[PDB]
């Protein structure tokens, strides 16, 4: 979707000159002026977006989008408008206010690939502004034409840059949450999205995953319409991809899905997702590690038979590892994973947790400046003592917590300031210790 010049004299034009040319009654002079404008808006640094808007050029550019007889000016103005729309919400608004949406949607059917591609790009920028413009683009009927552009036997016959553009614009139509995209628009888009999720290009796969992650971020009903399409196995596969740009959105999508129902969570387990976590929980990239632990916490919050799966895959030692050493935010997710595990696990599963060495690292964290994680941890111990109570082992556990220095940190918290904390402590103290 890219261009040139007439460019000895279309480079570095002044805005007054551009206005002069566009105001001439000459289509060719307007074309030259529009290209000059595009070049100012397309330069490497500080494009004069506001100056162009103030000159009142948008309405002219929009009208040039409809000049089928001069494809070059359609393309140049489409590019100019695209770059104005790439700015602030206010700059994107000016483009919308000029009536650009229906004009760009009309250009989607252009016989010229580079022109329909620019139209796609522009709509991506407009929809990317947020919920309102996203939904306005949809109301103008952008989805059908966009989907038609991908209606081919094999995606591979499409120009690579062209396909990446369509995928990205489609993902923005699935983006944002207050409100989320119209249910029927999501249903209309899903089938094509599933197809892109199986394409071989790394950027198309990444953005496809991001779109899926957007769609799974919300009520269980939204998660269900995605899981229903049977994409989980594919998401699990991409979860093991070598490229971080693909793994990140794949893990996010998987993580959103396990925040749903036990039935929906069971789907990721059935697909074999847990076998990838030994690697995800030790990933060099700290964000992956964080999201992986976060995902584990929503799985340990599941059924006992699901917690057992976590056990069978040998993931408890990995949780003990993250709890012992990791970026603090990851350690916080681990604490949650542990408290959720102890909250719904069987006595045997909880005993196992202690046998893996969860106690010491858990106590060492009680010394963190984060009342939230502290509550979570004290809460975890309570659940663990309760398991040892049903075993008349409440004493062997007290020693352990005393051995590693736990008590010397719980009593100190007993004198905390947050009622939730000092109360929780005191209770544990007088109930299990001295």
């Amino acid at each position: 979707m890219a261009d040139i010049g007439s460019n000895q004299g279309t480079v570095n034009w002044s805005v007054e000159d551009i206005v002069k040319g566009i105001n001439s009654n000459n289509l060719e002079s307007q074309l030259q002026a529009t290209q000059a404008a595009r070049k100012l808006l397309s330069r490497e640094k500080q494009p004069p977006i506001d100056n162009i808007i103030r000159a009142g050029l948008i309405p002219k550019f929009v009208s040039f989008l409809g000049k089928t007889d001069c494809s070059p000016i359609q393309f140049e103005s489409a590019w100019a408008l695209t770059n104005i729309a790439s700015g602030t919400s206010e700059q994107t608004k000016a483009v919308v206010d000029g009536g650009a949406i229906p004009a760009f949607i009309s250009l989607l059917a252009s016989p010229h690939a580079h022109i329909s591609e620019q139209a796609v790009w522009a709509l991506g920028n407009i929809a990317g502004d947020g919920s309102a413009f996203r939904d306005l683009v949809i109301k103008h009927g952008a989805i059908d034409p966009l989907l038609a552009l991908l209606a081919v036997p094999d995606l591979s016959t499409l120009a690579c840059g062209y396909l990446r553009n369509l995928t990205w614009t489609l993902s923005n139509l699935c983006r944002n949450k207050n409100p989320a995209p119209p249910l029927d628009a999501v249903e209309q888009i899903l089938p094509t999205l599933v197809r892109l999720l199986h394409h071989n290009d790394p950027e198309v796969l990444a953005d496809s995953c991001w779109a899926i992650s957007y769609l799974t971020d919300g009520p269980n009903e939204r998660i269900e319409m995605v899981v229903k399409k049977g994409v989980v196995p594919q998401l699990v596969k991409l979860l093991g991809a070598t490229e971080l740009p693909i793994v990140t959105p794949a893990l996010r999508a998987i993580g959103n899905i396990v925040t749903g129902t036990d039935e929906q969570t069971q789907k990721v387990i059935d697909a074999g997702a847990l076998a990838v976590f030994p690697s995800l929980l030790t990933n060099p990239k700290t964000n992956i590690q964080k999201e992986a632990t976060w995902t584990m916490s929503n799985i340990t919050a599941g059924r006992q038979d699901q917690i057992q799966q976590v056990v069978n895959h040998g993931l408890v030692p990995f949780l003990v590892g993250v709890l012992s050493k990791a970026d603090f935010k990851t350690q916080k997710e681990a604490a949650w994973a542990i408290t959720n595990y102890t909250s719904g696990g069987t006595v045997e599963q909880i005993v196992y947790l202690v046998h893996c060495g969860i106690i010491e690292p858990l106590m060492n964290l009680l010394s963190a400046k984060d009342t939230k994680i502290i509550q979570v941890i004290l809460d975890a111990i309570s659940n663990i003592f309760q398991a040892a109570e049903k075993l008349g082992e409440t004493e062997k556990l007290s020693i352990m917590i005393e051995e590693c220095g736990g008590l010397d940190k719980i009593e100190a918290l007993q004198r905390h300031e947050n009622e939730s904390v000092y109360k929780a402590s005191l209770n544990l103290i007088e109930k299990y210790f001295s």
């Binding site: 397309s42 920028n125 502004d129 971080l244 740009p245």
Partner: peptide
């Protein structure tokens, strides 16, 4: 590779 952020909300065409 690249990693971390979600795709840009808007993209300006430099070329």
């Amino acid at each position: 590779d690249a990693q971390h952020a979600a795709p840009p909300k808007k993209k300006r065409k430099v070329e």
